[PDB]
Design a binder for this molecule. Structure first.
Ligand SMILES: Nc1ncnc2c1ncn2[C@@H]1O[C@@H]2COP(=O)(O)O[C@H]3[C@@H](O)[C@H](n4cnc5c(N)ncnc54)O[C@@H]3COP(=O)(O)O[C@H]2[C@H]1O
Ligand SMILES: Nc1ncnc2c1ncn2[C@@H]1O[C@@H]2COP(=O)(O)O[C@H]3[C@@H](O)[C@H](n4cnc5c(N)ncnc54)O[C@@H]3COP(=O)(O)O[C@H]2[C@H]1O
Ligand SMILES: Nc1ncnc2c1ncn2[C@@H]1O[C@@H]2COP(=O)(O)O[C@H]3[C@@H](O)[C@H](n4cnc5c(N)ncnc54)O[C@@H]3COP(=O)(O)O[C@H]2[C@H]1O
Ligand SMILES: Nc1ncnc2c1ncn2[C@@H]1O[C@@H]2COP(=O)(O)O[C@H]3[C@@H](O)[C@H](n4cnc5c(N)ncnc54)O[C@@H]3COP(=O)(O)O[C@H]2[C@H]1O
Lengths: 349, 349, 349, 349
């Protein structure tokens, strides 16, 4: 979705005085046909008749003005009301797939002037915004909150299965009994989870000020899933992988690549064709996840610890002194790794 | 519900251009009486007057056309609009239990031609689809999402009690202190849970594209309950039972047989009449559930392990070598069974 | 609420053909004034004019008939439609606090005949049912599901705090470190929880067939709270108390007595005035809760075990043989008590 | 928000007969312009024409009276209806930013008389209450329950992350491995959580009797978060802090100060500028949280225990006798501290 159009959809997002007026116009079954321009003079050929107002804009003035036939002309920044009750006359030969004279006039005029045109018909209750060759239908807040509420509810469900997989994987990690199947199942779920988010983002945006609580909900639910997934890929990929690299694999399984078990294991560096094979491939965490999250060791110094010990299993067998031989590890970060790792083995297994 | 009718209900499911038009017609309080046929000529006797259109179909064309009196005739695949404003004249002697001339004409005509007929009255806001001797009332999306949201909410509650029973049964399983009552209580709940799903499936289907999130929610909630229940029946039935057999018992307690404590224990091979008896019948898991789910041993090779050890208790007392004597168990699947079982005993008890 | 009136509210509960018609009448803004009697002849003095129908009842017939002025007369069992468009003439001197001629006529006539009278005004959308000196306003399904959904949601919250208290009390019970404060806090919460249920029951009832899922939700949420609370009172009351007695204390703290910390401890047999005192009163479970729920020992035989050991602490120190000396305890119920108790001490503490 | 205005908003809160009438007026699209005064005589100059009623007030009388043009005059306590159909004539020169003659008359008249004036336009469906120079727009119940339901839902999410942080911090506390970062992260979340509450309080208030369940939900969710947060600040602040002091820091991070990681640690007495520094600052709980909550030791006597041992670590190493040397600690409070602390170390780590 063009960012050029996003800045336009903002103009009529919940919270703006312009949207407040549109809502009143819809609820009042009045019609609306708004033309947004910066210099009316430059477009005096597509604007006929009506009344020249040139007054400050307000929701109430726009609402009252929409009680009349025709179009209203506003300054692009929505701070002025230039015309009212005018006859918009764009080129009739410009292509349009819209219905009704108001909408066909809207799209045509937007294309022609490269400006924004808003249309609201008395019959239906949708807000249609035309920019250039773009068309965006703005849904009512209640429809959006309905979809959003459902999505969030779906995410809770996914986040739950994710936590269960992750806590079970944790046990397998400490006991060094992890299989590729286990890792993939966890990654798969986390990928799916983040796709849901990406797919509802636009909905959140159309909510504007009414999207406040939904953003807060999403943030609590996906708080650290991304870092956790990147750390998982760094700990189980076939061969050493930099964080930046891992972040791309994540991004890639959220936009394009489908989180398929076989597909995920493949991109991780494991050559498999049969899904059943995964349960046979034994793997061992490198140790990044446990070093940054629990041991609170910066990923940068973690690279050194991994370099010298290779896996979490060897790191958990290391001693405070051994660890101290690592570049970036003093006495504090040494006991941190040690105690934190031993603590988890005693409590989770 | 006939599958022949399901393919028809799809024609007007949320997501289709045809339903989009019907919704606009309802919201606009216009009436509608649609006749779907492939060859108009063949039915020129039930079609009188109106205008011959023979144009491509579109939601907007149908919406506008419904502003006129009479019926609209469309091609069965909803890609053409043949007539508009016609007078449908089915045989008045065909039985009908409907009200109002529009609906009685609808059902009669559907019966007569064996074709689909849709009726929407200006007064009410329901979509009535007539096929042959079938009649399906399509509810609005908001009514469906309301029922569905409640059901899902009810399932969460059931899934919770299910997890609690299952985790407690787990403890009893490892400690080999399981009683028939325990197993039945768990099976009962899982059966109830899956019935809820089956009973709301039709609702999900009427939602069409608006059922996307509801399907995803249901899938996370019932992710593996079915396999888990089949494995429970295989581990506690009175005498050895094949998976296929277990799958039928499950299916049977989801469609016909009521998940009654006494009824479930009975079908499991235990002869009981008094509910209080269950707490007295001591039972021991065969070990399938723990072998496939935790040990990730294919059910097929599991049959061999069960054959040689009979119960989970004996399997947990077996050694890596002992297990290796089983057909299908090498060194990996041997340690898998061993370590996984011992791991659970140490963590859960 | 009189049970005599409950049987009347059923007549217009969601699911009945009569309510289906009323809903259509409300949605269509038609008015309604229904008089339910068994023998029209006996009331020919309060019924003037109109048309004598004496036909089978149906929602459609009632809906159509309500398009006319006046009242409709139906048989008490709603299987016949006697009159339509009649003028109901009850005694004008009968007291009534209602507004508008339709409602004042309704209440007056119900009082006079001791029969049921239903009124629906075109203006508002409520269903008013008059019986004798009773008046019941039936709310729409959407309003009910809204309140119910909130209550259920509130219960989840309470059930959560209840589980947390109960699981913590469990730890204190096994470790024999329970204080009166702990018990009261748990009882208090469970009492509150069940009050919520009692207070929303009427709402559930007004929902009729639309209350199906709400009943199922409530049942999962309050599944065994009552037995659990009775067992708590039996295990911590100041002196030995029979189950029946405990069940009355529960019932009493759900209807009359407010679940006050000081009030609860008082009724339990402990003489306290200051809330802060509770944290000082040391108490020890008798053992009923653990014997019936976990050990699955019938409350009747439990009385014997408690008799001989007094507290759970002594029971957990008892041996299989010791327990066998109890009337009703063989070898199975002996190991049951033993293993189950020791199992919990090892897992929870 | 002035408390003087709060007492006014109550007059039209859900549950009051006055609001019941307003709702009926809105649903009936009638207009309303109410003037509340105690002595009509004193204002006979702003009141012209209409009918002098001087009758008892009732929702039905007000509803019927609003069917006429003009304003209605009521006694300030809403127990009398003085005028109806009058012409309110406030000073036209009083400033007003309202639209339409009804609203401009409302605000002007409220300012002039310092009395309350209510306005409801036929077009829209909002209730505008004017007091002095204050203006309060009362939203419908459905809009409020929607926002509230979302907020509560958002809180659940926060309360969850809070519990997870707190339970993890618990482990670190017992193991005496707590870092400033850990404490701040937990405090931050709890602060955020309580802000949500404060920010939705006004919504709850506008709900009146329809806010009952929402208040109960909030109470279960935030049951003891405040005490828990105060105890956290007392246990980890840089230097000894009195409860009253801690309560102010809490209050301050809920109203003004933003719960910023760096900002929180700073106010706790730790001099830091870089967020990354927190993970390096080792800290140790004083022991208040564990003494009051678990050991149930009054905060007052806790001060003594902390005085003599300084930290929870030393308290957990203390013996029953050692503790007995503390002012306020006998044998019971001595074993309480001991057993409770050792119990937690054995179960959580
Ligand atoms: N060139 C044409 N070809 C066919 N029919 C024509 C027509 N011009 C006008 N009409 C018919 O007149 C109806 C109402 O015209 P109206 O100006 O009141 O009411 C109009 C007008 O206030 C506004 N509008 C449409 N186009 C406009 C334009 N180019 N400039 C300013 N306002 C416009 O939208 C309203 C409704 O449009 P809608 O099509 O639903 O309804 C149209 C249409 O059925
Ligand atoms: N044979 C008959 N017996 C008794 N009354 C008769 C009748 N024929 C017509 N009417 C009366 O005229 C009303 C409206 O006729 P209309 O054609 O405008 O408006 C009709 C028409 O546009 C459509 N419709 C009904 N039957 C149809 C058919 N066989 N073919 C095409 N359109 C039909 O549905 C609309 C409403 O039907 P509705 O019954 O509610 O309303 C009917 C009914 O009260
Ligand atoms: N004795 C009286 N005193 C003062 N005003 C009188 C009156 N009798 C009739 N009216 C006026 O006429 C209005 C409509 O009469 P209507 O018979 O059409 O329409 C009536 C009628 O169909 C029905 N209804 C009321 N009382 C009834 C009765 N005793 N028997 C049968 N139907 C009744 O309810 C409808 C609306 O009643 P609503 O009061 O809202 O509206 C009443 C009222 O304002
Ligand atoms: N001084 C003035 N300047 C410009 N226009 C004037 C005017 N006085 C009256 N009107 C026009 O007449 C409309 C309706 O007057 P109305 O008395 O029926 O119906 C009125 C009246 O019943 C009530 N209302 C307004 N001001 C009032 C006042 N000072 N005292 C009592 N009632 C008032 O609110 C209704 C609607 O007001 P609304 O402005 O929407 O609608 C107004 C407005 O467009």
């Amino acid at each position: 979705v063009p960012q050029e159009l996003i800045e336009k959809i903002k103009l009529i997002s919940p919270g703006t005085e312009l949207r407040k007026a549109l809502d009143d116009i819809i609820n009042a079954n009045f019609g609306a046909l708004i033309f947004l321009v910066d210099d009316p003079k430059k477009y005096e050929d597509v604007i006929q008749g009506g009344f020249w107002l040139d007054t400050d804009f307000s929701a109430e003035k726009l609402y009252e003005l929409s009680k009349m036939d025709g179009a209203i002309v506003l300054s692009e920044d929505i701070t002025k009301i230039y015309y009212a009750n005018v006859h918009l006359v764009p080129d009739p030969t410009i292509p349009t797939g819209e219905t009704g004279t108001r909408h066909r006039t809207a799209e045509r005029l937007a294309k022609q002037t490269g400006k924004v045109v808003i249309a609201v018909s008395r019959r239906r209750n949708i807000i249609s915004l035309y920019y250039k060759n773009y068309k965006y239908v703005v849904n009512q807040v209640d429809f959006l909150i309905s979809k959003v509420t459902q999505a969030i509810s779906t995410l809770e469900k996914y986040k739950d299965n994710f936590n269960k997989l992750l806590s079970e994987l944790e046990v397998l990690e400490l006991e060094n009994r992890v299989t590729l199947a286990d890792v993939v199942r966890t990654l798969a779920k986390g990928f799916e989870l983040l796709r849901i988010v990406e797919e509802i983002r636009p909905y959140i945006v159309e909510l504007g000020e009414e999207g406040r609580l939904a953003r807060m909900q999403l943030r609590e639910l996906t708080e650290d899933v991304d870092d956790l997934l990147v750390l998982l890929i760094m700990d189980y990929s076939s061969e050493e992988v930099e964080e930046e690299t891992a972040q791309n694999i994540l991004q890639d399984f959220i936009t394009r690549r489908e989180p398929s078990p076989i597909s995920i294991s493949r991109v991780l560096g494991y050559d498999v064709q049969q899904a059943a094979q995964l349960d046979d491939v034994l793997v061992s965490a490198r140790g990044y996840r446990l070093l940054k999250t629990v041991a609170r060791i910066p990923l940068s110094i973690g690279y050194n610890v991994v370099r010298m010990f290779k896996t979490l299993d060897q790191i958990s067998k290391a001693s405070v002194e051994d660890l101290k031989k690592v570049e970036g590890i003093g006495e504090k970060r040494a006991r941190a790794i040690s105690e934190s790792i031993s603590s988890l083995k005693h409590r989770k297994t």
